[PDB]
Design a protein around this ligand. Structure first.
Ligand SMILES: [Zn+2]
Ligand SMILES: [Zn+2]
Lengths: 7, 59
């Protein structure tokens, strides 16, 4: 599962 | 598609630069909030090569 905005 | 006005997820809302996770079956994106997945949870799955499915794809 790709992720984005994980900072 | 990073379109800031495109509607996503169970909630039918934009990404709004929120944490999102991509279902490994439908390939659509879901806000972590709406599927109960925190950034720490989702990054850990991604790091460990563990696939994740949204609630609709699970059923
Ligand atoms: Zn949502
Ligand atoms: Zn899905």
């Amino acid at each position: 599962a790709r992720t984005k905005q994980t900072a | 598609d990073d379109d800031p006005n495109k509607l996503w997820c169970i909630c039918r809302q934009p990404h709004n630069n929120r944490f999102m996770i991509c279902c490994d079956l439908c390939e659509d994106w879901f806000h972590g909030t709406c599927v109960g997945v925190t950034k720490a949870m989702g990054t850990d799955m991604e790091n460990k090569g563990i696939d994740w499915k949204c609630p609709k794809c699970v059923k």
